[PDB]
């Protein structure tokens, strides 16, 4: 007889990681987090002195 | 009868039992203080206060985590219930004594408790070096109730590796050798011997430390002759053994749980990892100062700590080889269990190599109180002692309860703990090679990427260490009663049915010379 | 003085399912209730002045 | 030079302890301190093993030196065999009253 | 200092330092391939049914498990003991500057000729002046000239510290009542940071270390211009 | 060595109560005469406020805090020097 | 002698499930919680 | 290991309820502390 | 029809572990000498190059006029 | 029923009231070394006396009186001596680099030598060797008890263990007296700090070994022990030939040596 | 050691004892399936008409998944020892895992 | 059939591939028509049908092999389970920041980080390979 | 005999990295010199050598504390 895998285990597996890749993305771009990648590439120096 | 049977014990199993109840409340207290040190890392800034409070909170979170974790899990935990019933003895051969070692363990972590709640803290590193532990630098009682707190806790285990070694020594059946007592027993012997000859080494330096502080002695005080430096030795004569006592019954439970798993009669090459563990625990009392490279010792003094500490890897590396080859050929079963086992295999590969790396003391001078040390240290302990105590929960729980946990369940805690541990540490190898310090609460800004993504990784394991409190009560709460285990013709201690009656071995196995 | 071990024996071995540390008579539990009493009194009493040192002191 | 005055074993000893000076004065072992030497383990000549109940663990070392030990539960019954080398035991059960 | 997202040592400043970067790469290729060639073995054992569980013979392959193993670690021992052994080397210096570790600063002595000592603590941020780093900063840096052999003396007047300069491979414990000793020599002028390395209490995060390595006759002027 | 005594054939209380008497007390007796003769209090040395003794870093948890537990007015100096 | 069997060799009760999840939420609760109100002690102090 | 079915049964809902209140259990206590740690300090 | 011919029966595990560690150790000296070249090599000729006609008081000079010293001006 | 030889303890109160007494006994000396007060610190000595006592008195109603020490109890309780003598040898190994360590490289607060400017050590040659010739002689005594014991002559065993103890005492008299006359005191450096931690923990190992042989004493006058049964008596001569052997490496080491 | 010839004839004089007990039919397979090998058919041979002796017809067919299971990957094996046993299995009336359904999962 | 607890000391039935002829029959007790087949089983096995084979293997064994080996779907539940709690851990992580963590420190205003950056190339911050090195000090921007 | 001082030289009987002796010596040596010198009538500046050297390599606090121990009489070297 099917068991608790064979019936939810597609649903699982996709809601689970719908759900971890949004809430990430969304923590990750969406809140004000400070990643401080190198500047190599991204930053224009600019006078200091 | 409850106070007889809990308060007054003088049963091995109860006992043990009280050791994994008392370690899994100190897990929780040892992981809410590791939350804790990554919130106040986890974005640059100050979140707490200064580096008092953080290293009050850094302090705590090891000293919980080795003797109020890892030391009563695996030692009196495990080696309580396992050791007699695996040699067939009726009890441990000092009963009575053994419930002291248990009951010495609370007073010391309220001792513990109470130094962080007195005055600032002791903000000192589980190290506790002088002058900053002294009493200038940390007036006021915190660092004294630290020093009693250490010395409760080593009396518990000195007096628990008498009773070990002389139950392991004495109460084995008439025929059985010592060569024919199973790989977790021989761990455990081993790392009593450890413990009986480091503890009193550290106890005579604490001490050392506390009339420094209260009797105005001046061992490690250059003002009256003393120096800071001997201090150093004597604590790291005692602290270089501890972490192999930390990981040594971890060793032995790898060994039974890949056994069992890859459906095995015994651990390939058994006399090898015999030797490699004896090994081990031998050059373990000769490698001390690698944790002092940079104090300025001599440069032959530097070449000869040097070696020592890394002909270590030989005896290790015979029984990582051994594991893979008694999963060579297994029947593989993939139960959680042998998961935590495998995740241990491969982690404490990594850890033990980063040590390589750290053994150079020409490169451990750029390496010495950076995070590479935390990342080598936390992958050997929070990858390898929590891998093995874990793997050996699952694997035993059946035994000690009589209920079954839900693998489905418990695979999902091992796969987010894994997530977590490896994001969480990892990343402290660069922050480690680029120059970040230990024991900072705050750090320049060019660090803040790799931090972030270190205590996002601690909140990962968190969510794993709260599902794990729920699977547990899972178990009791649908009481699946445990029927047959697999392979009990070489697995003794699951031979008197789950959980055991309070009394086995009341007639002893019977067991021929020819 | 005289060898009077075998009437201890005798006591000690008297099938009245006492445990050891009760088996010598009233005596054994007076004086195990005074060192519990004192145990347990003096513990509070540990906790009393834990919190009575957790905050500064005028 | 000369007094005596301190009782001996046989005098004094008691219990336990006395049970197993006795038993050992008559070359008996009631407590298993002993190993109990192989019969050569076929079905007509097995390994007899005392108990005091109706089962008892045996472990068989199978070849000298063996590190692994194989343990059953022998029962009272006909001969069992272990299960590694097949060397035959039988439980003898009596009553330390028997 | 350290760049964002940085992964390994920070770019050597000394002859030593660059000795200790090969020589970490070569330890590293034999982690890597030590880790990997676990991980694999690992994965074989366990990607087959097929299974074979009667006693297997351990003495063989136990021979190949200690000796390549220790030949392996004689390779790594021997590169890293010729490293040790050169630092040690007696290399003259031309300089001697003392520093004592305090709670929480550093202070500088050079009295090789004149008393020159001065104190030199963390930059507060809300100070720090617009292109500044955070925590990193000093108000009066360890000025010294470059391409020259440099004695270090490090102790300390109250706990422990640790004088580090992670890109000149440095890093000398501070101890009351005991002079260690360090050699420096920076190729190149600039600016080269640490900071304290050994817990030392409240701002154990916030005392670093800035050397200014510039010609000669600038550190003469300079040593001059601070009496 | 053999020491220079000697005796053997086989284990005995005799035996050790004569070394009892005829070596070990008789050395006690010895060493008690040799004590008890450069006995008898020692001309105390000039007092100099060394840095390196009569540490002070905490009081004395008993008398006024600044006495040794086992101090002898008349050869302890105090951190100012002796008794008056 | 003292009971035997799952649920009976343990200091705690399993007999009723939700008390249980009552005794383990306040045991490893109160683990869990003691370091942030030991923190949140040493800084209301000073 | 084979073992016999639940003597208790905890179904779904009884897991999430269980699941539930023992996250709420770690989380409510230590948020709150964290939550006020302006006013612990900033006081 | 016709018979199945008969295959190798014995020392399947044994074999399969033979073929698999020596198709591992060609991985190592494989990776070695990438690992060589794509990193420890790559670090030798970077140093070797910049210090090749490196000059250390015009490096000075140039730091010095970008105002970065409190001892030169 | 067993029908094993090894001893299953009844349930008993001594290792709760023993780790209470522990920490009575830290707490105690933290409130005394901290909050001028007494009180905690006397009432952990009394509840660990009164612990040590019912306990061992139960250790001793366990064996003489129920019969429960088998040859192979006996045999554990050999092997648990043993390791807490090797215990309690690490632990004065640790002071001992402490004394080797400071006295070897004497650092220039004390002048930059051994003994340290200031300092005027005894001199070896009277109360400390007295007191080496009574801790041998006492080794010398005890092995007399030893043998009369074993073969059942009770009162040369009583007369010799009696010899054996004074000497114990006179050993602890003259080493009281000698910490009294000392011109150096615990606070004089280095020096102070080795020599008064050594010897006095040394010290009270003798009072805990003297006790202990005393106890021996009063279990032989009530007839506890047999010519083959007495592992309390041979505990305590282990543990006293410990402290002899320990007095030996101190006279050596710091009186002689470091003098 | 012994050539593979020699270990065979061992086995099939294990099984071929004619008075062969159902203890040390059990222990002979549950032995032999641990090594590194799939019985030859003469092993199973004898095997198969010890079980006949035994009365026992499902560790016939027991017998004969254990051969497939020992293949694992190598499916060419288990079509080819059955082919090697179609005598021995008509002759006994033994019907395969595969004609009982008892393949299907 | 009916296991219980009581009996953990005798032999017992396993499904093992490993173990193929296990200690005991999976069914011992028999009915009158059970009792027939196994006398029918002493007789030539060619006369008993297909069902009564399997009859007396499922009175024999509890799972045939493909039965005990098969493969199962829990991988699903088990990594969509633990995607779901890491995605659980992101709501602690976005608590955290909205309610714990204040504003960083000024240092890293975008105006800070182009002014620092361009100090750490004056002062040629990691010039052989880390920082420096990517910038073309020619060109005055960052190599391609 | 040797002006041009440039720091104390490399000195073979303090080879290692712990050079407390280093300058407690050259400390040590100068005040003895200077007493020999003083006594004599003789001239200081033949100690000068010792003198350059503890200056070098002596922390100025532990100078000032071993000269204020040296004025109180409580300094424990041999001078
Ligand atoms: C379980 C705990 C544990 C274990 C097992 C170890 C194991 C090792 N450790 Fe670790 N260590 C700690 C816990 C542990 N460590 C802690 C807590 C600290 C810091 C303490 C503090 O400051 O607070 C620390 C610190 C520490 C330092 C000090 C760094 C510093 O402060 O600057 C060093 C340096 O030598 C070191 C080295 C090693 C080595 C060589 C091993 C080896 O024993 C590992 C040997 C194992 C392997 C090598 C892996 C398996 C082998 C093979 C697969 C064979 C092939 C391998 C080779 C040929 C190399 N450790
Ligand atoms: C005849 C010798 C026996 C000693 C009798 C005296 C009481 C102390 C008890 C003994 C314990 C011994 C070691 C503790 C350290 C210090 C005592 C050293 C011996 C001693 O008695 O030293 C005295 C100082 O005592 C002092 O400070 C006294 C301070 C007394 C309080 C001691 C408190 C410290 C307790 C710490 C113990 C921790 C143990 C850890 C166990 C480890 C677990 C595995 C010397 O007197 P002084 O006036 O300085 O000089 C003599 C001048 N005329
Ligand atoms: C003063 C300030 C606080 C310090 C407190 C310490 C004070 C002093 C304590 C002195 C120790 C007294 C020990 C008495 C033990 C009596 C019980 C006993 O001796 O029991 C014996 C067993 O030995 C046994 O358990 C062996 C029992 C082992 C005893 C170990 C004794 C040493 C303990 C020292 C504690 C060390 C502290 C270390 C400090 C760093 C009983 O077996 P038998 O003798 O064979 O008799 C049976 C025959 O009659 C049958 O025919
Ligand atoms: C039956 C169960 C056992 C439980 C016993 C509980 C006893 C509780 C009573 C304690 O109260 C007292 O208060 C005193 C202050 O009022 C202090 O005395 C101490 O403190 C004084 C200064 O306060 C010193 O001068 C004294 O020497 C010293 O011993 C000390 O805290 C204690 O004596
Ligand atoms: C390091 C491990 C822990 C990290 C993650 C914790 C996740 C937080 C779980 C929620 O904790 C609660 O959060 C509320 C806010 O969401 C707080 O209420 C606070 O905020 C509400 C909204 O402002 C007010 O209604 C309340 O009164 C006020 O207590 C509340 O006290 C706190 O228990
Ligand atoms: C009364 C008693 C007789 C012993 C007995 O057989 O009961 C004797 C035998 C040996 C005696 C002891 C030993 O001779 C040694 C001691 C010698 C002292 O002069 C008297 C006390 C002393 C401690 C004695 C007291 C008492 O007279 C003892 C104990
Ligand atoms: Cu100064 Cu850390
Ligand atoms: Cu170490
Ligand atoms: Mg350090
Ligand atoms: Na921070
Ligand atoms: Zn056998």
Redesign the interface.
Same mark, same amino acid.
Not at chain 6, 11 to 17: C, D, E, L, P
Not at chain 6, 48 to 58: A, D, F, N, Q, S
């Given at each position: 007889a099917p068991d608790f895998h064979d019936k939810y285990g597609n649903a699982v597996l996709a809601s689970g990681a719908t759900f971890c890749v949004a809430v990430w993305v969304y923590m990750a771009t969406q809140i004000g987090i400070e990643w401080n990648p190198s500047p190599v590439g991204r930053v224009t120096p600019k006078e200091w002195r | 009868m409850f106070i007889n049977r809990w308060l007054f014990s003088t049963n091995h199993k109860d006992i043990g039992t009280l050791y994994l109840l008392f370690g899994a409340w100190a897990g929780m207290v040892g992981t809410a203080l590791s939350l804790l040190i990554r919130a106040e890392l986890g974005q640059p800034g100050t979140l707490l206060g200064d580096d008092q409070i953080y290293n009050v909170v850094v302090t705590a979170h090891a000293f919980v985590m080795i003797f109020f974790m890892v030391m009563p899990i695996m030692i009196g935990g495990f080696g309580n219930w396992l050791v007699p019933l695996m040699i067939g003895a009726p009890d441990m051969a000092f009963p009575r004594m053994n419930n002291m070692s248990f009951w010495l363990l609370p007073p010391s972590f309220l001792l513990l408790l109470a130094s962080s709640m007195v005055e600032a803290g002791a903000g000192t590193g589980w190290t506790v070096y002088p002058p900053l532990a002294g009493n200038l630098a940390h007036a006021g009682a915190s660092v004294d109730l630290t020093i009693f707190s250490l010395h409760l806790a080593g009396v518990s285990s000195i007096l628990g590796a008498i009773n070990f070694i002389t139950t392991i020594i004495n109460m084995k059946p008439p025929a059985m050798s010592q060569y024919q007592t199973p790989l977790f027993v021989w761990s455990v012997m081993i790392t009593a011997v450890l413990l009986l000859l480091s503890l009193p080494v550290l106890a005579a330096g604490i001490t050392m430390l506390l009339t420094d502080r209260n009797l105005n002695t001046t061992f490690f005080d250059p003002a009256g002759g003393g120096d800071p430096i001997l201090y150093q030795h004597l604590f790291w004569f005692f602290g270089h053994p501890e972490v192999y006592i930390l990981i040594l019954p971890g060793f032995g439970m790898i060994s039974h749980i890949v056994t069992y798993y890859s459906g095995k009669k015994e651990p390939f090459g058994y006399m090898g990892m015999v030797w490699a563990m004896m090994s081990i625990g031998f050059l373990g009392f000769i490698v001390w100062a690698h944790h002092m490279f940079t104090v300025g010792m001599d440069v032959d003094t530097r070449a000869y700590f040097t070696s020592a500490t890394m002909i270590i890897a030989i005896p290790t590396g015979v029984k990582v080889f051994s594991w893979l080859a008694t999963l060579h050929g297994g029947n593989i079963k993939w139960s959680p269990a042998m998961m935590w086992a495998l995740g241990f295999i491969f982690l404490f590969t990594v850890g033990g190599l980063t040590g390589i790396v750290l053994a150079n003391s020409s490169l451990d001078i750029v390496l010495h109180d950076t995070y590479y040390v935390v990342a080598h240290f936390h992958y050997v302990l929070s990858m390898g002692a929590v891998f093995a105590i874990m793997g050996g929960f699952v694997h035993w729980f059946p035994l000690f309860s009589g209920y079954t946990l839900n693998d489905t369940w418990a695979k999902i805690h091992f796969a987010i703990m894994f997530v977590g541990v490896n994001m969480t540490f990892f990343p402290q190898h660069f922050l480690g090679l680029s120059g970040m310090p230990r024991r900072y609460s705050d750090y320049p800004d060019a660090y803040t990427m790799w931090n972030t993504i270190s205590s996002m990784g601690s909140f990962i394991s968190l969510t794993a260490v709260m599902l794990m409190v729920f699977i547990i009560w899972e178990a009791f709460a649908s009481k699946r009663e445990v029927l047959t285990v697999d392979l009990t013709t070489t697995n003794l201690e699951w031979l008197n049915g789950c959980p055991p009656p309070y009394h086995t071995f009341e007639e002893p196995t019977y067991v021929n010379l020819k | 003085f005289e060898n009077r071990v075998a009437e201890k024996q005798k006591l000690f071995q008297e099938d009245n399912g006492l445990p050891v540390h009760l088996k010598g008579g009233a005596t054994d539990n007076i004086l195990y209730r005074v060192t519990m009493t004192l145990c347990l009194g003096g513990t509070l009493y540990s906790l009393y002045c834990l919190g009575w040192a957790s905050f500064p002191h005028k | 030079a000369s007094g005596g005055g301190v009782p001996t074993d046989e005098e004094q000893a008691t219990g336990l302890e006395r049970e197993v000076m006795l038993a050992a004065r008559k070359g008996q072992d009631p407590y298993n301190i002993l190993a109990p030497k192989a019969t050569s383990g076929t079905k007509e000549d097995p390994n007899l093993v005392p108990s005091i109940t109706n089962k008892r663990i045996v472990g068989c070392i199978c070849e000298e030196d063996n590190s692994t030990v194989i343990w059953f539960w022998l029962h009272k019954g006909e001969a069992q065999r272990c299960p590694s080398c097949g060397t035959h035991y039988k439980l003898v059960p009596h009553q330390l009253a028997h | 200092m350290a760049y964002p997202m940085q992964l390994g040592f920070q770019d050597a400043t000394s002859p030593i330092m660059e000795e200790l970067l090969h020589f970490h790469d070569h330890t590293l290729m034999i982690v890597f391939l030590i880790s990997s060639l676990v991980l694999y073995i690992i994965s074989l054992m366990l990607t087959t049914k097929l299974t074979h569980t009667s006693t297997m013979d351990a003495q063989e392959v136990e021979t190949i498990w200690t000796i390549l193993p220790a030949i392996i670690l004689i390779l790594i021992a021997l590169p890293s003991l010729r490293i040790l052994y050169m630092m040690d080397e007696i290399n003259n210096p031309s300089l001697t500057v003392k520093t004592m570790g305090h709670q929480w600063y550093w202070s500088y002595e050079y009295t090789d000729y004149e008393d020159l000592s001065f104190d030199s603590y963390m930059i507060p941020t809300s100070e720090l002046k617009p292109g500044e780093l955070r925590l990193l900063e000093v108000d009066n840096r360890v000025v010294l000239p470059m391409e020259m052999t440099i004695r270090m003396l490090v102790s300390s007047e109250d706990v422990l510290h640790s004088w580090a300069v992670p890109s000149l491979g440095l890093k000398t414990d501070a101890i009351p009542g005991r002079l260690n000793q360090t050699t420096l020599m920076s190729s190149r002028p600039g600016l080269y940071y640490g900071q304290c390395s050994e817990i030392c209490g409240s701002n154990h995060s916030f005392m670093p270390i800035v050397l200014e390595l510039v010609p000669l006759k600038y550190f003469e002027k300079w040593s001059a211009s601070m009496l | 060595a053999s020491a220079a005594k000697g005796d053997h054939g086989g &284990?005995? $209380?005799? &035996?050790?109560?004569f070394? &009892?008497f005829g070596? $070990?007390?008789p /050395?006690?007796a010895?060493?008690?005469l040799?004590?008890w003769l #450069? /006995?008898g209090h020692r001309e105390?040395?000039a007092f100099?406020?060394?840095?390196?003794?009569?540490?002070? &870093?905490?009081p @004395?948890?008993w008398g006024d805090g600044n006495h040794? @537990? @086992? #101090? +002898?007015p008349r050869? +302890?100096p105090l951190p100012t020097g002796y008794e008056k | 002698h003292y009971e035997e069997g799952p649920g009976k060799n343990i200091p705690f009760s399993v007999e009723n499930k939700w008390r249980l999840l009552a005794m383990m939420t306040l045991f490893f609760g109160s683990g869990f919680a003691a370091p942030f109100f030991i923190v949140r002690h040493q800084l209301l102090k000073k | 290991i084979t073992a016999k079915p639940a003597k208790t049964p905890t179904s779904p809902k009884e897991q999430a309820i269980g699941l539930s209140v023992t996250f709420l259990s770690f989380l409510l206590p230590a948020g709150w502390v964290l939550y006020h740690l302006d006013n612990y300090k900033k006081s | 029809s016709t018979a199945l011919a008969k295959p190798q029966m014995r020392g399947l595990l044994a074999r399969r572990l033979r073929f698999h560690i020596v198709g591992a150790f060609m991985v190592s000296l494989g990776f070695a000498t990438f690992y060589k070249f794509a990193v420890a090599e790559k670090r030798k000729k970077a140093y070797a190059d910049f210090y090749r006609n490196y000059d250390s008081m015009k490096d000075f000079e140039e730091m010095r006029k970008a105002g970065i010293f409190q001892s030169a001006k | 029923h067993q029908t094993h030889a090894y001893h299953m303890v009844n349930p008993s109160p001594w290792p709760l009231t023993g780790a209470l007494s522990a920490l009575l006994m830290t707490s105690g000396l933290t409130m005394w070394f901290h909050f001028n007060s007494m009180t905690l610190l006397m009432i952990g000595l009394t509840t660990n006396m009164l612990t040590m006592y019912q306990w061992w008195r139960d250790v001793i109603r366990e064996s003489t009186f129920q019969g429960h020490h088998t040859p192979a109890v006996q045999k554990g309780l050999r092997y648990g001596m043993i390791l807490f003598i090797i215990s309690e040898v690490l632990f004065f190994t640790g002071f001992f680099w402490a004394f080797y360590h400071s006295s070897l490289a004497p650092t220039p607060e004390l002048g930059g030598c051994w003994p340290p400017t200031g300092i005027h050590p005894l001199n070896p040659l009277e109360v400390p060797l007295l007191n080496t010739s009574v801790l041998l002689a006492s080794g010398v005594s005890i092995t007399w008890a030893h043998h009369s014991l074993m073969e059942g002559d009770r009162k040369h065993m009583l007369q010799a263990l009696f010899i054996t103890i004074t000497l114990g005492v006179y050993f602890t008299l003259l080493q009281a007296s000698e910490y009294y006359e000392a011109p150096f005191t615990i606070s004089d450096g280095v020096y102070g700090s080795t020599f008064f931690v050594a010897t006095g923990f040394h010290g009270l190992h003798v009072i805990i070994g003297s006790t202990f042989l005393i106890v021996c004493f009063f279990r032989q006058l009530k007839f506890h022990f047999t010519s083959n049964h007495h592992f309390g008596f041979e505990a305590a001569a282990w543990y006293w030939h410990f402290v002899d052997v320990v007095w030996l490496f101190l006279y050596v080491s710091i009186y002689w040596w470091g003098s | 050691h012994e050539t593979d010839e020699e270990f065979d004839a061992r086995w099939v004089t294990y099984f071929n004892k004619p008075d062969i007990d159902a203890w040390e039919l059990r222990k002979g397979m549950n032995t032999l399936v641990g090594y590194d090998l799939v019985p030859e058919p003469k092993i199973i041979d004898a095997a198969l008409r010890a079980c006949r002796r035994l009365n026992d017809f499902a560790s016939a067919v027991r017998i004969l998944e254990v051969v497939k299971d020992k293949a694992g990957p190598h499916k060419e094996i288990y079509p080819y020892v059955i082919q090697e046993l179609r005598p021995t299995l008509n002759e006994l009336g033994i019907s395969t895992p595969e004609e009982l359904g008892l393949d299907k999962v | 059939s009916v296991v219980k607890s009581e009996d953990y000391a005798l032999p017992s039935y396993v499904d093992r591939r490993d173990y193929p002829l296990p200690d005991v029959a999976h069914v011992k007790n028999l009915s009158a028509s059970q009792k027939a087949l196994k006398e029918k089983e002493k007789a030539s096995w060619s006369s008993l049908s297909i069902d009564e084979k399997v009859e007396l293997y499922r009175l024999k064994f509890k799972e045939s092999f493909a039965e005990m080996n098969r493969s199962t779907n829990e991988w699903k539940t088990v990594v969509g389970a633990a995607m779901f709690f890491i995605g659980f851990t992101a709501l602690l992580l976005i608590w955290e920041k909205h309610y714990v963590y204040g504003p960083i420190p000024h240092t890293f205003e975008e105006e800070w980080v182009a002014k620092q950056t361009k100090r750490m190339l004056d002062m040629k911050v990691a010039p052989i390979q880390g920082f420096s090195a990517k910038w073309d000090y020619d060109k005055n921007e960052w190599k391609k | 005999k040797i002006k041009n001082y440039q720091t104390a030289p490399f000195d073979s009987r303090f080879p290692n990295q712990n050079q407390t002796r280093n300058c407690w010596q050259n400390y040590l040596d100068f005040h003895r010199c200077e007493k020999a010198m003083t006594a004599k009538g003789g001239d200081v500046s033949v100690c000068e050598w010792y003198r350059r050297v503890y200056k070098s390599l002596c922390p100025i606090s532990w100078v000032s504390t071993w000269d204020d121990r040296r004025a109180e009489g409580t300094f424990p070297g041999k001078i």
């Open positions: - | - | - | - | - | &284990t005995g $209380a005799r &035996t050790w109560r070394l &009892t070596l $070990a007390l /050395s006690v010895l060493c008690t040799n004590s #450069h /006995s105390r040395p100099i406020p060394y840095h390196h003794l009569r540490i002070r &870093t905490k @004395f948890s040794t @537990f @086992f #101090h +002898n050869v +302890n | - | - | - | - | - | - | -």
